[PDB]
Amino acid sequence: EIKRFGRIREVIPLPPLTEIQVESYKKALQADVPPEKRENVGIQAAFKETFPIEEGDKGKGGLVLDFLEYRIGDPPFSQDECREKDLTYQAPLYARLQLIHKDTGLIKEDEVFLGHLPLMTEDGSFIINGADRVIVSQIHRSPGVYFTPDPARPGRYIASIIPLPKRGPWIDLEVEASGVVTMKVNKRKFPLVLLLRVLGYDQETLVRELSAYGDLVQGLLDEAVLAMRPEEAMVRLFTLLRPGDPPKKDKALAYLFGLLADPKRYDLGEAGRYKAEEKLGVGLSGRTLVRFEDGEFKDEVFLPTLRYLFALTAGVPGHEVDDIDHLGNRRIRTVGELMADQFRVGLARLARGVRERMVMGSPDTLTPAKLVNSRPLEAALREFFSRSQLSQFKDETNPLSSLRHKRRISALGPGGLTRERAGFDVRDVHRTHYGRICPVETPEGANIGLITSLAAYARVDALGFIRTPYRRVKNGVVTEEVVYMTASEEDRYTIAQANTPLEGDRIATDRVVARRRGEPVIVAPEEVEFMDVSPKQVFSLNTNLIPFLEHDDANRALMGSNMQTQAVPLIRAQAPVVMTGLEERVVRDSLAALYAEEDGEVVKVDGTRIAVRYEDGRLVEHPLRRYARSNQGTAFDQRPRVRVGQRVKKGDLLADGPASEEGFLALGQNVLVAIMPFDGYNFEDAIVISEELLKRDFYTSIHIERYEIEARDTKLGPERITRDIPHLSEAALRDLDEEGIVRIGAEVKPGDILVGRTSFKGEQEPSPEERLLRSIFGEKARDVKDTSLRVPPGEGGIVVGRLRLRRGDPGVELKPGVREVVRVFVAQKRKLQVGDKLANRHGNKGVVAKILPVEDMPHLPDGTPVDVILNPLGVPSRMNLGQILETHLGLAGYFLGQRYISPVFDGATEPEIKELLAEAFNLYFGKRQGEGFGVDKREKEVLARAEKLGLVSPGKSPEEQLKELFDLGKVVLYDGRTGEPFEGPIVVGQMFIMKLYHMVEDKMHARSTGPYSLITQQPLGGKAQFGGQRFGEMEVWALEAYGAAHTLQEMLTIKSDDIEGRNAAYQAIIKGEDVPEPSVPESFRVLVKELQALALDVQTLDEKDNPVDIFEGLASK
Amino acid sequence: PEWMILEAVPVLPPDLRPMVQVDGGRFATSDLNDLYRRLINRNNRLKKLLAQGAPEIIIRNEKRMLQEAVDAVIDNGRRGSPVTNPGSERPLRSLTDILSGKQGRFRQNLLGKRVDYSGRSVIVVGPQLKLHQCGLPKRMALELFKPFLLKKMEEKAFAPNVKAARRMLERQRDIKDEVWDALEEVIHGKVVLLNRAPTLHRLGIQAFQPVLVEGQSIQLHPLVCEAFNADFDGDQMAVHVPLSSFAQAEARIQMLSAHNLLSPASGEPLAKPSRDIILGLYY
Amino acid sequence: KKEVRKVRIALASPEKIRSWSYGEVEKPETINYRTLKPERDGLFDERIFGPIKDYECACGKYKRQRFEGKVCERCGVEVTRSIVRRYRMGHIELATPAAHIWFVKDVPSKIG
Amino acid sequence: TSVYIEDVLHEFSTIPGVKEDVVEIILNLKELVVRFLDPKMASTTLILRAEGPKEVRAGDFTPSADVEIMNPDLHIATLEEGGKLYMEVRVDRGVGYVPAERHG
Amino acid sequence: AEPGIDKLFGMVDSKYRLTVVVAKRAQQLLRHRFKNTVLEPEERPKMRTLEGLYDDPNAVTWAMKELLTGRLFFGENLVPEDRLQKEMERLYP
Amino acid sequence: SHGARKGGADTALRTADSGYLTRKLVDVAHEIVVREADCGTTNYISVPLFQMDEVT
Amino acid sequence: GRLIPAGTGSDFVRFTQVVDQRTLKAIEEARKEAVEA
Amino acid sequence: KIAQEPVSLETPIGDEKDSFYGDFIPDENLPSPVEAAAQSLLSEELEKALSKLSEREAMVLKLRKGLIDGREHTLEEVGAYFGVTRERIRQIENKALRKLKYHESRTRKLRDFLE
DNA sequence: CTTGACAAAAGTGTTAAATTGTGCTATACTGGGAGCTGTCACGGATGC
DNA sequence: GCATCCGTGAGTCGAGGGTAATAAGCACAATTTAACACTTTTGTCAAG
RNA sequence: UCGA
Ligand SMILES: [Mg+2]
Ligand SMILES: [Zn+2]
């Protein structure tokens, strides 16, 4: 059965969790959208901005290119096809433009081909270079005007302005304390009355609106300048701000024009114009500062920002300082905004590719056919999707991984902030944050608060203003209005909580929870204005999957969430028997599962393909991808859960997912858990387990790895993938099918070749001993040498994927000078080993310490032993009670088996679970009563000892006492070693855990003697690079602190890069002798010669002041 | 001081400014190369201009470019925006670029470095282990002590000589008792070191008697774990070895864990009972 | 052969620097796009800095250690290990004399 | 211990006409209990055939001497329309519990 | 801990002096294949072995007990390095 | 959550500062090592066990 | 990359020399081989 | 293929600043400790395997295979050494290499180094 | 161990075919070009 | 000497990750390299 | 970017 819980009932479900990536990108798509009627913004803005292109006026050479549509469609290859090809998933985009001569007035229209622009896949993750990647959302303070208290002046106030990043300069209204006012932009200081020159103002209008506020007149007045006129004093600051070029007149009408009036160089987001407009209490249309009207420049922006600034500084109410980190003042860069922006500037590079090319030439043969380029645009957009900070490897570690990852936002990147500049207020959580971004979930490293994750119900409009759903109310009336009230708008009304005294759709108790701006205040049935849909919105995805989360401290909660990201697939995976009930749309919106699109009936199961002929009469099927490799090597599988045939409704799940249990996310398992200090093996957040599960293969998964090799043609001539090797014995040639590659289903130890390759080594005369060695056996010197591709240590198992495409094959392109390439998957079943990372939803980590045999184990009177027995230490220090309550509900619930839905902040409580305990116990004591048993003497003993501290209420019979004890969460356990009970009760039950990504089978590495770096002979690093650890500066220091002189010396010399040191060492130990003393570390010698390149005379002396030769006979010239 | 105006510019050796290819087939190289190159370009072009009696203006300007180029091949960034590989914002790293800085040839290669005969892994509690005891991964230790096992195989029959041992090991995972118990004969006596980053107290690096145990994990005495600033939440500790018998002496004498049991800071005990122990004992 | 207990530092003079060098690097070019052999004067030149191959000359008339240090007459490469490629410097003779930005732009500014 | 099928590459690849994949059919393996009628029989072998749209169970095997199944009702795979599968297994006897990875 | 430590440290003034002692002596033991030493059959630091029980090859432990008796002698500027090292590689192969 | 998250960020950045400190310390007194058993200085500084309680 | 002036390789204690009894008296004699000269 | 130029070693990789390119390149241009001892080994093991050959044919074998001075001496030269015709030196090589072949196929010491 | 005969490996001489380096083009072209931000602390030179 | 600028720093090891794309041309002299012819050396063979 |  499934029983579930909670008081507050969600009035509306969660809008799709995949849209913030898909929809906000889709807005800049305009795919199906007609070529004529379009949105003018997004990708269409990227066109209308860079168009129309023109050089001339009516004159000798004129040219004008004007914009028409960019055919969307024709994807070259489907997702899967692109992924195996290493090609980007993309599609041709077709721009139709007209080339009109200024002179003849002859319109010559031509449609051209821009290039291949990557298109979005289904779940919202693009495929670039054959690899699934993702664009993480970006965040920055929304464009507009702002007002803060003067950082310099004690009581004064300063203003600021700014558009899209780099797409306009900063502006500041600061009053330096002269009593006069100096505006400052891009490192310079000039009077506020300076810029008013061409602004269309003079001595008059200035004092018209100057004194309308207060004492502010004088500082805004000047004499030595103001006598001048717009085109006269125009050259003043132009002479100043740019000494680089000669201060002409005509060039003061140009260089300044592009700064503001140019819509393309000042381009200001539709949101910036918006918010700043309704902010200053004025109106505007153009996204520029001032328009270019017929010579001089008119005014729109400056007058209002002056009005509001001077107002605020005067102290007239309603004009306040706009909050800095406030969500109402900060927008979100989404996929569409980003891609479209990059399209704008990249296509501007292409605009250079247009205006410049059309005059070197003859207007005779002319058409955008020859005038249009690709690489500036195509490679700009190619650059955005890879090298940028906001685009990286998709999180395929699990479905919920990519989900959450796509729902994460970073203030970092190109035009946000950077690591070097961050304060407290930067990564902090603003008062009005609330139901918008997750207050906890964030990397526990130096990125805490740096990368926040999106909340549940919170949305993002095209304006970047985040809007959290609320609920309107008029005097105790619950309205069906779902209010998306803006952050800035949220600060206005009075907002209650979802936990409000809900009864009879009316207000129950007088005093009610509520707030303004984030300030808690008790309210009355009248002043009630808004409410909350559900507390769910106050957190993110993973954070919402934690039951009784109100009992866990924020730290460990955070850890629990990001660890839910760290989760891996499980073959037998079992969804939490106690969850928050959110897992339904978790598997739906993840798009990792297969459902019924409409009403229909199953025909055939066939774990390859499930064919279901729908009620609509048409024959449709939905095949399945079974056991496919992901980015993290985490296995992707979909298990058909429907019989040979039956009829299903629309939305019913016909197939599982990498972790999906009957339409529920299954991370780990709910297996029996005990809590006690067991032989100190669980010491300090350590774990312990039982072999029993290893039999049942509870946590065991499948991991796949990507193997590849290039056939590249050498300067001595080409290589190839073949089955021949000169010296290879028949033994190693086994698994190769017929052509020199490993077949499907063959086990490979981590010595074993997958793909063989053959080359020819450069010709060098064998050393004398080698010459003779070659002579005795007469071994042919086969000019072909083995290039074969082996497998790394620790990675071994069977083989599934085998794909090889040579040069010239259908739908493939290779590198310039390569012949073939081979790619093989290696699949391996990994059972959970000793030392692996495991953790729960409540944020308690650990590693496996010594799995105990099924024999010995703290069983119960039913003889059922436990599976973990986790130590009770990390609980009080790290303060998480959620795992405790979860374990109790699992205690009473294992007997019942029914599920538990405990939504965050609303769910099971002490009385409920108490009744569950009493219930399960009644039926348990029943279980032993009719089966011919009674109270165990050992249990009598434990109850007696517990009765001393009042753990069980005295005077009551041991039956009732065990009822109480069992109710407390703890029962009687018998040591599986001795058979004797334990001095006191031990809380046990069913609790949810997880098998973390980090696996000892991988992380573990060692090297004796490997290769070295080219520059300096210092050994390599990394694992697959086969390299040793480095000894840090602090390591060195500690080593000195011990006072081990030689250990340190050998470390820095013989043991690391020393010239003959390492060699003579290997010699020594190989011969059993003792390693001699080293001479030069050899990184040192490099240092010396570097200093020589700096003409630093490097003189190494000796016991008394004499040149020592550090380089033996080396440079004596 | 006239030397500060130096005429002949020292050129760094080619192998110090490496250029070599890879499996991909393309060639790579350092930045200093390109710097040197463009420099010589300017110098030579200047030389071709001077003798032919070029106008004084172009000459002077070329000398300007000479100074700026040289000084760029030294301190690049000390004057103006540094010269970069054309089209890429990545600045060309000069001499002074490598000599100083975090990852510079100083702090990165002379005050610390990658070392041979090492490796690391996860950590697991040691309740059976003594103060001088560490669980050592099987496979790790095999590919750790490989020279030692080589000589041990030289002494103890099974293969005639040195190379035979190597090739009888690296190929075929055939870890059968010939090895598993010989490495043992070399194991006793000399001990190795364990370190848990960060290295704060010297006790962050201690030494333990190697004991080979089945697994890929690492066992360590629960009490000194505190001194290493390490809990069991999934940490990773690194292991190495004091090759020289002198350095080995050092390792077992003052470097051994069982030896320094007190705080070098507070003079108070170090490994004193922790968590569970205290719990049981007290109760 | 001798303990090094002391490390000095000083200013290298032009003549000294010349003595450090095994030759002037003329053609500012890596190698041939075909042969991958160090260019005639190219920065990677094995003819002055050191042989591309251990104990060998360039053209290959001296392939062996039987000739030690003897300069090849068909090539002009000292027959020796390629090790010297790391320890042997060059120099560039600058037409017009040029200072060094170090003691110039540094805080104390020696020359200034 | 031992399992073979004329149709498969490995422990994974999905057999047509069979709902569960191979390793799931293996989930149904170790959960199968079988006793021999002889104390002296070390190893053995078993043969299985299920064609058509009929399911597969421990009882569907080919009975023989010295073999008895204790759970004929054990579900193996739900075979869809016309699923054809051949199967064979060596069920041996030993002591304790040894994972597949430690024995060949 | 390593058996017989407290006394060892109790001998040399410098905690480090001991290390120098141990190092040099032990290395000398590896030089001659253990025929130098002042340890008799009962004092031979035998190591436990499944195969057969032999003397521990490690020079360090050997050095430990070697000084543990005190039969050795340690001092600075004891004798000129010449005759010191020349007669050591003579007596034993 | 406000308060806590603030705390966490704090501790992190402060770890970085710790690294700063320590390194700098190892670059000054590092050249100091106990050498002369007794230098022979007659100097010394007394350290009273008596600390004044403020405002008390 | 040399011997650190402190620790075991200190310029105080690295001078310490050790001899076993047999070889001790072996050299303790041969020092007197120079009394005839 | 010729088009693309050498890639800078200073190219930062990964998501960080500190992850570089240049120090990720292996140095194979120089011998390795395992290779040093391997070469020294073949040298020594063959050096002792030398004495089991006829005092004349061993010395001769050191020429034809280019051992002594490193430069291979032709049949005519070794013949001009022992005062024997080059044909003699030839059959000397046959019988020497085969006698060694007996000792090899028996001892199985140098059976390694088979690449 | 050696002599003559002879096949192939190797040496050398001379050319054809490729690769590479150089000079020049004439209506008139005559002072670039690209932007960027949300630290922080202290030490020094330098402009008040 | 008083405010205001260039200058130098800022935590440990790791796990991975990665791969890429602008620009004039034509005749001709000067060599370089590939081709070819043929002498000699050297290694093999038949048979003293 | 994520572990510790
Ligand atoms: Mg830890
Ligand atoms: Zn030569």
Author numbering:
A (entry chain C): 2 to 1118
B (entry chain D): 509 to 791
C (entry chain D): 2 to 113
D (entry chain A): 54 to 157
E (entry chain E): 2 to 94
F (entry chain D): 1074 to 1129
G (entry chain D): 1469 to 1505
H (entry chain F): 324 to 438
Question: What's the publication's text?
Answer:
Crystals of CarD transcription activation complexes were prepared by soaking Tth CarD into Taq Δ1.1σA-holoenzyme/us-fork (−12 bp) or full RPo crystals. The structures of CarD transcription activation complexes were refined to 4.4 and 4.3 Å-resolution, respectively. The protein/protein and protein/nucleic acid interactions were essentially identical among all of the four crystallographically independent complexes, so the more complete and higher resolution CarD/RPo structure is described here. CarD does not make significant interactions with σA but interacts with the promoter DNA from −14 to −10 from the opposite, (distorted) minor groove side of the DNA such that the σA/DNA interactions and the structure of the transcription bubble in RPo and CarD/RPo are essentially the same. The N-terminal ends of two CarD-CTD α-helices (α3 and α5) make direct contacts with the promoter DNA. The peptide backbone nitrogen of CarD-L124, at the N-terminal end of α5, closely approaches the backbone phosphate oxygen of the template strand (t-strand) at the −14 position [−14(t)], possibly forming a hydrogen bond, an interaction likely facilitated by the partial positive charge of the α5 helix dipole. The bulky, hydrophobic planar side chain of W86, located at the N-terminal end of α3, wedges into the splayed minor groove at the upstream edge of the transcription bubble. Despite the relatively low resolution of our analysis, CarD-W86 was clearly resolved in electron density maps. The mode of CarD/DNA interaction is incompatible with duplex B-form DNA; the normal minor groove is too narrow to accommodate the end of CarD-α3 and CarD-W86. The minor groove W-wedge increases the lifetime of RPo by preventing transcription bubble collapse.
CarD, first identified as a regulator of ribosomal RNA (rRNA) transcription in Mycobacterium tuberculosis (Mtb), is a transcriptional activator widely distributed among bacterial species, including Thermus species, but is absent in Eco. CarD is a global regulator that is an essential protein in Mtb, the causative agent of tuberculosis. Crystal structures of Tth and Mtb CarD reveal an N-terminal domain with a Tudor-like fold (CarD-RID, RNAP interacting domain) in common with the Eco transcription repair coupling factor (TRCF)-RID, and a helical C-terminal domain (CarD-CTD). The structural results, combined with supporting biochemical studies, establish that the CarD-RID makes a protein/protein interaction with the RNAP β1-lobe, thereby positioning the CarD-CTD and a conserved Trp residue to interact with the upstream edge of the transcription bubble, using a wedge mechanism to prevent collapse of the transcription bubble.
